[PDB]
Design an enzyme around this catalytic site. Structure first.
Site, short mmCIF file in Angstrom:
data_model
loop_
_atom_site.label_atom_id
_atom_site.label_comp_id
_atom_site.label_asym_id
_atom_site.label_seq_id
_atom_site.Cartn_x
_atom_site.Cartn_y
_atom_site.Cartn_z
N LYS A 170 20.03 23.84 -45.32
CA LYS A 170 21.11 24.10 -46.02
C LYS A 170 21.11 24.91 -47.33
O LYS A 170 20.44 24.45 -48.23
CB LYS A 170 21.60 22.83 -46.35
N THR A 190 34.31 15.95 -52.24
CA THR A 190 32.96 16.02 -51.39
C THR A 190 31.96 14.86 -51.30
O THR A 190 30.82 14.97 -50.66
CB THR A 190 32.14 17.52 -51.64
N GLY A 192 29.90 12.13 -49.89
CA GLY A 192 29.36 11.77 -48.53
C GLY A 192 29.34 12.91 -47.68
O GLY A 192 29.24 12.64 -46.37
N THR A 193 29.38 14.09 -48.22
CA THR A 193 29.34 15.38 -47.02
C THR A 193 28.26 15.18 -46.30
O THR A 193 27.98 15.31 -45.21
CB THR A 193 29.70 16.63 -47.88
N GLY A 194 26.93 15.08 -47.00
CA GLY A 194 25.52 15.16 -46.51
C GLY A 194 25.51 13.92 -45.42
O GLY A 194 24.81 14.28 -44.43
N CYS A 195 25.85 12.76 -45.58
CA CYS A 195 25.84 11.66 -44.91
C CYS A 195 26.62 11.98 -43.72
O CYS A 195 26.03 11.53 -42.39
CB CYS A 195 26.17 10.40 -45.29
#
Lengths: 248, 248
Positions: A170, A190, A192-195
């Site tokens: 990423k 944004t 929790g975007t990664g999760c």
């Protein structure tokens, strides 16, 4: 559509925007029955982390056993691992049950050098797809932060050699034995975007031919979730994306 | 539809059919953003409970604070409370934040006489709707199991006097200051039905005029979830209902 059971092995977020809460919502929104093993509890907020409560690695293992000894798991997403004994316990169960389609998010902004060491040696050879950003990739490789595109591509390939079936660096670049493939945000919510992205990749993998296709659908879905983030009314800090933008 | 945030304060089920997993799926399936405070962890299965891992009442309180100090909660469902200090911690935060639309499921098949005592004195005066079956109602009232309809109606009314705004005695009869109202299963996969119904009642309450209407829609939805339970492929024991029967 065939029934798919998805499992998330991660930490919690009481405010419901990240952790297994986000993973489970994502699974649900993408047509997969969700299961969840908790690795650590955290009093979390839209304004940040208040405190972390650790769980005995033995109970994490017990949780893993309750699931794998009874429910057929088709895809798995891994988040917060917290410590060495947890990493070991997870790697061990993954190996024992020949778990496939393992998507490993890289929650380490933290882990002790011992935990990271265990992760690269015991866990990496078991993941189908790892999804780190630049800082995390360097940490996993114990290398300098990638300065250019070439160095970034080199790290992606290095992670494959380490056992990962595929890598999604990423910045996004997808790495596979075949080669590389290249892949905006207009909201401040944004959290929790990664999760969510890693959960989405896990839930969608079984419905596609390759990682390229699933990565493509996963990102499209995520953008749509972010594009509706502002319509939600949760928190005074950084809000979560809207996992159910397609339903309500 | 207006945005509604729903909170569940309960235990976990790794297999995803009961506990906060079921509560969260139900909230999601019914158009509500879900939050969740974990009161206890359990290595649970479609074949039963393998083991329970307790959490310090203080961390439950910390979790409650992370949520109430940041997210506006419109409805709340309460499940497993486990012990006296947890009951007290929950009651205290419910009172402090003037939490409304509190649906209390009665998970006590177990609780010490001390915990039950604390529940009736500190928690009951805060619940909008309690949903016990006959055995649970008698236990809450420290009375004999209702032999007839009259005794059953008497217990429902007794629970109202105790502070509950409404009571849903599961045989189903709904009790309110106004009066009473009367309310099949063709599947063996009923795991998590109780958790699901109470979660559904909580999520739907804000969308209705009275408990009678929300109880009516909640049951209709639940029957549909049970009617699709067999199409799922989870577990070797008693499967869960299908929370997303309306979506996939």
């Amino acid at each position: 559509m065939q029934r798919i059971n998805a499992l998330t092995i991660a930490g919690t977020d009481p405010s419901g925007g990240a952790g297994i809460q986000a993973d489970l919502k994502t699974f649900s929104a993408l047509g997969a029955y969700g299961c969840s093993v908790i690795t650590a509890l955290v009093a979390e907020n839209t304004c940040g982390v208040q405190s972390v409560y650790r769980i005995e690695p033995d109970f994490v293992a017990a949780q893993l056993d309750s699931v794998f000894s009874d429910v057929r798991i088709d895809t798995t997403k891994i988040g917060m691992l917290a410590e060495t004994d947890i990493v070991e316990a997870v790697a061990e169960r993954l190996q024992r049950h020949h778990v496939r389609n393992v998507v490993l998010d890289t929650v380490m902004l933290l882990l002790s050098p011992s935990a990271i060491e265990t992760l690269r040696v015991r866990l990496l050879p078991q993941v189908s797809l790892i999804t780190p950003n630049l800082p995390e990739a360097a940490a996993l490789l114990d290398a300098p932060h990638a300065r250019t595109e070439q160095e970034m591509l080199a790290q992606g390939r290095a992670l494959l050699a380490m056992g990962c079936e595929a890598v999604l660096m990423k910045g996004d670049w997808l790495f596979t034995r075949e080669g590389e493939q290249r892949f905006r945000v207009n909201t401040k919510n944004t959290h929790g975007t990664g999760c969510t992205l890693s959960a989405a990749l896990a839930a969608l993998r079984p419905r596609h031919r390759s990682w390229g296709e699933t990565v493509n659908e996963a990102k499209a879905w995520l953008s749509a979730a972010l594009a509706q983030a502002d319509t939600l009314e949760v928190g005074k800090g950084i809000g979560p994306v809207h996992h159910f933008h397609a339903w309500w």
